[PDB]
Symmetry: C2
Subunit: 244 residues, 2 copies
């Protein structure tokens, strides 16, 4: 597994993927000094993880046949699953798809948003979060609650999931831990779980759209299948809108 960009995200993705014991080999990929210092800080806690190979560098060649490449490449891993994380995701998931030529190109989307959005709702109801099911489609403020899975009530909970990330950046400057965890996705991909996550891909032809995060089944081949739901007129109408 490869993870490019050792910003606070790349490390919380790298540190979370490592706690999941997902890779036999983790590659961190332009600031040479920084990269080697992080690699050796991980390598020093190898006992407390299950990954005997952690190596960083500036040479993409180290990204050789790397089944998963988390982006926070084609040349050396022409077969890899691309997983984009860089913030303006839905757009940059278009970008990558068009740069790589790959068929294996996924963006974090609203996996994390729908993740907290769930926690909060169950938190209010007093139900274990695993037993409440409900998602957020659309772009990672324009997120679109699929209430069909009180109008002003659920919008309110959603409101708190929008202002959240924003207010986080004011205080911190970036989300590091929150998106490291949700990157959950590496888990399902590697282990071929065929689980369903709201992730960003092409939705042209859905919701009348002719030019985002939809529920997709994830496995060792990436998205094996995309859902084409028949949602409510407004929900669907706000899909065109979030697209816009």
């Amino acid at each position: 597994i490869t993870v490019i960009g050792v910003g606070a995200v790349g490390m919380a993705c790298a540190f979370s993927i490592l706690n999941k014991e997902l890779a036999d080999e983790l590659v961190l990929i332009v600031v040479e000094d920084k990269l080697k210092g992080e690699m050796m800080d991980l390598q020093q806690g190898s006992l407390f993880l299950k990954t005997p190979n952690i190596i960083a560098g500036k040479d993409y060649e180290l990204t050789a046949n790397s089944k998963l490449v988390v982006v926070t490449v084609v040349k050396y891993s022409p077969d890899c699953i691309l997983l984009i994380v860089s913030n303006p995701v839905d757009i940059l998931t278009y970008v990558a798809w068009k740069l790589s030529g790959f068929p294996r190109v996924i963006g974090s989307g609203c996996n994390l948003d729908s993740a907290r959005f769930r926690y909060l709702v169950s938190e209010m109801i007093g139900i274990h979060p695993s037993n409440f099911h409900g998602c957020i489609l659309g772009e990672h403020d324009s997120s679109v609650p699929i209430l069909s899975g009180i109008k002003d009530m659920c919008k309110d909970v959603h409101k708190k999931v929008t202002e959240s990330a924003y207010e986080i950046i004011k205080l911190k400057g970036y989300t590091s831990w929150a998106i490291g965890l949700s990157v959950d996705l590496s888990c399902s991909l590697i282990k071929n779980l065929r689980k369903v996550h709201p992730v960003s891909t092409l939705v042209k032809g859905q919701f009348g759209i002719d030019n985002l995060s939809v529920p997709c089944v994830l496995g060792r081949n990436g998205i094996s299948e995309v859902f084409k739901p028949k949602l409510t007129v407004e929900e669907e109408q706000q899909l065109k809108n979030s697209a816009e």
Copy 2:
């Protein structure tokens, strides 16, 4: 945590509670040789489990258990409601000796038929309803079967089975009718290929003892009072979705089903009543 009955069910149950590190103490309860022999087999494997296992017959050993799982059952023979009363007779000896020593415990009824034998326990213990639960329809296999028809993980499929843990159960298709029967039939076929169900119901009791011991506030279709629901008026117990925490059932759900679905839960209720 106390298990009562060290037959195959209780031992599969026992082995699941130890496998989930829910128990820091575990009691097992008529044949001594089996009791010790079962207690020594587990203890001989301790390094591979957290724990402090103690078996015996004296119910004094159960004193102050927090959860008590009851598996004490009896076997059919060549020659359905006599059984239902034998076990009731078994419960007239078990439940009083449980409450005599752990009155604030959580009773978990796994012995069959549960729905009825969950009403028996409540009626014998005089416990509040929240501390008297039945393994019920804890659905998992229904969800699994469906979740493979669709090529998706079963944690991203959601649906449940309510009513009698039996042929009367209802699939709540509001949140496939074949897959329901395939489950019930498979329960029957297991009981006569094998003599009983154990592995499966053990995994399930684990699921439930986990929610409860750890206060996960998790939702489980389990047998409790539903008098006042679905046009029901008899103190009948059935599997509805309930919220399980460190105080047994904290809240029972009041679901809103299609008309067909609500007439079937009355049937399922009617069918249990006729024996009860």
